[PDB]
Symmetry: D3
Subunit: 161 residues, 6 copies
């Protein structure tokens, strides 16, 4: 089964948006969000990847308790959230903790409840509503096979360099 | 100057929606919100009032640090958020702490920054997006004179009974 | 379907053990726990009940986010944790929030994962290990039909008085 | 040994100052403190007392973990902090949890370390520095015998009424 | 306009005092404060500077929500807090987040309210009261032009080396 | 007196178990604990050591307020918790903050109260009860002289390499 390390930038329930400077590895505060919304899951990027937009591939990790910015988590994909914004393509791979038997019944996107997927969709659709010249469109949930394919080629793109 | 006590139901930054049973005075959990949003200010109702919808008049209080559910706060109005939802009319009076000199430059709705008012508007417009058969419309900010008038008549309505 | 109000005494993740004085309705700190353990779910009692030990019937409520001590929650039973301690019988009804469609797939004790039930069992078995003259025994999970029966007779016992 | 119930108004580490309305029993926010200071211990008043200033006798309770406003704690005195402010006399009885063997080596004011007593003194001396027309003077730590005497007469004063 | 990166050592509302080892870049706990006081703003140092005392130039950053130790924040100066302690000179540049339109009305020290500046002054004047052989004196607020000048020469001093 | 730097991995009161990758220095989430237990003290490892099991020597640090993962703390030993688990030997040195006069009365294991040592023992004995093929045995508290000896040889082992 596929497995990778996700560096968590943003803990769940945060209104601060943290980034990592990929040159130095330092955590940076991007901004305090302009809307009254909180990140629905722990958010980060997959280590040693180069995604479809020239930045590392983003990842959502379902955790029982949040972690701190900069922490590594061994994760496995169960699906992916596909979206296009002002950057360009900006897809997020949905993951669970790898090697944890408490998440063994979550194998594909159908195993995740609709209310949770709807909530995650709602965040990314609406969190930049009050920022001018920033939108999102083409929001769509896809299965694990599609998620594994995008991880695979993002590792290939990274190795070429 | 006008002054009243607000019973805070919901602290700022909460995703739990608390109500008060007005018969008993007990705090009740209404629901965990279906959207990934947090209450932008401390939220409650004005004591000894009966609003335009047959329930007590709601109030938003700007606090530097949040309080707990059930706590009283002496407040004064600076404006009001006017809205209509599935209940009917459901206006919220915007307030600051009374007798605190740190809020003396906030006297009317123009003194509150646009980014804060936009954020408060955004919460109430979008927080019930994933609940079916629940909407809001006619969202509008009004000045202190209009807010003081609605408080005044809500006290009259309450005394008649 | 059966439904009742649970008054939450202890939030999830707390090491403080709160009780309610049933004469006054006041929240009281019983004690800070002697073991390094935290309450695995939100813990309280069902209103207007008199259980098999002469005190109100205890209840465990599965919540996504914890509440404060004294808060009411409309709940429905899905099972029960049966145990005997130094008090005598001391059963806890396992519940979920009533009227919430996100918990509709949890109807009986089989729908709750083993890891969660094992964790809840582990707390009540071990949390009084360092308190002398305090034990527990006969720890056992039972189904909803058994839970509904104990609620039913505890309401009957309460009405007789 | 002497024992009494303390109603905790203010948790440890808080910058919000809560009071209780003694007519209704409701918790009220007095104010957010003007200095960058936090309450060094859990703070409240002893139930059914009338102190040397016409209000209930205040109490500081040493707890391992803080509680919520309005919670009762069975406590026993080990000393008292004597002070005079703009109100008049305003003494605070230092207490530990009663019936807890982990506090059995704390019997009198000498058993409490100097650094903790100095820190508690520092709070009450300096927390109203930026509020005009508010001071404190005659700050002094006294032993348990003196504390027990003030509790005793404050109960007598309360019973006369 | 002037702009720089501040590495936040201490979040707002903390009683732990963190430092950074400038050789390694590791966060270190200096000490738990001896007084019952909390840091009034987020506190750190400006990257790539060498101040008037041979250490990096300290900075206070006004944030709506606190960050974690080690996080970078792009900031711009609006003033400076001038003080002398047992180290020697130990000035702190007051900043707001750069490129955030919500702070555009804060351009100079006059735009910051007196209550906030008084509170920040109060912390640094009193937080070492219970530490022997440690004082502060010559506490004074100065404008942006003075702050920009000290940043400018601290960058020059750093480049010389 | 002996003194060393402890890198804190796990803050007190956490159910997340963090490790450090000793190759990179990155913090990693090992797992969310399977039992409803929280870490009784701040937990980490001593820098530049190689213990009796081929990994760095673990350390428990008594702090008044918890720190974040990755933070350095100058500590001194007062005792050691000796235990054998599925790894092999896995001893933990009990420490207090070095150069802090508030901990000067804690010099050896006898100065630490029995309730605290019992609680720490209880955590490590029971926290892996629900993980299969994981046990602990030979749990025993030893004095400072024994702790200093194990630190001494773990530094020797580290220097050989
Ligand atoms: C499927 C996927 C996720 C969830 N879900 C939503 C909120 C929390 C969870 C959750 N949370 C957990 N853990 C670690 C405590 N486990 C699961 N399980 C697959 C059975 N689900 C429920 C069903
Ligand atoms: C006008 C009204 C509110 C705000 N505002 C937005 C977030 C926090 C505040 C705030 N917060 C405070 N306090 C108590 C710490 N005071 C004020 N002032 C009127 C000057 N504003 C700023 C300007
Ligand atoms: C069955 C029962 C409970 C859980 N469980 C364990 C931790 C959190 C949950 C949980 N949490 C949630 N909510 C409100 C966010 N929903 C559910 N679901 C029935 C599908 N489960 C998972 C499966
Ligand atoms: C005497 C009195 C108080 C303290 N002290 C200061 C901070 C925490 C404590 C404290 N905290 C505790 N508990 C419950 C965890 N127990 C004690 N003991 C009397 C031995 N002290 C230490 C010595
Ligand atoms: C001037 C400078 C600072 C403040 N002040 C004090 C506490 C919070 C604030 C504050 N907080 C905010 N944000 C981000 C939420 N914005 C501002 N504004 C310049 C209008 N002020 C108020 C007026
Ligand atoms: C001996 C060793 C530890 C403790 N103890 C247990 C919980 C907190 C403490 C504690 N906590 C503290 N600090 C920093 C606030 N100081 C001490 N003292 C040696 C006197 N003890 C009490 C007695």
């Amino acid at each position: 089964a596929m497995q990778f390390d996700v560096t968590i930038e943003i803990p769940k329930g945060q209104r601060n948006k943290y980034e990592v400077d990929h040159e130095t590895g330092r955590v940076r505060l991007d901004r305090y969000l302009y809307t009254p919304m909180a990140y629905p899951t722990d958010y980060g990027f997959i280590e040693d990847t180069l995604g479809d937009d020239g930045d590392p591939l983003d990842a959502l990790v379902l955790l029982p308790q949040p972690v701190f910015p900069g922490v590594l988590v061994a994760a496995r994909p169960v699906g992916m959230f596909r979206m296009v914004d002002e950057h360009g393509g900006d897809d997020k791979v949905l993951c669970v903790p790898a090697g944890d038997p408490r998440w063994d019944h979550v194998q594909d996107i159908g195993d995740v409840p609709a209310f949770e997927l709807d909530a995650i969709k709602h965040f990314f659709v609406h969190y930049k509503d009050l920022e001018p010249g920033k939108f999102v469109k083409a929001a769509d949930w896809v299965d694990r096979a599609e998620a594994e394919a995008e991880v695979q080629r993002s590792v290939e793109r990274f190795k070429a360099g």
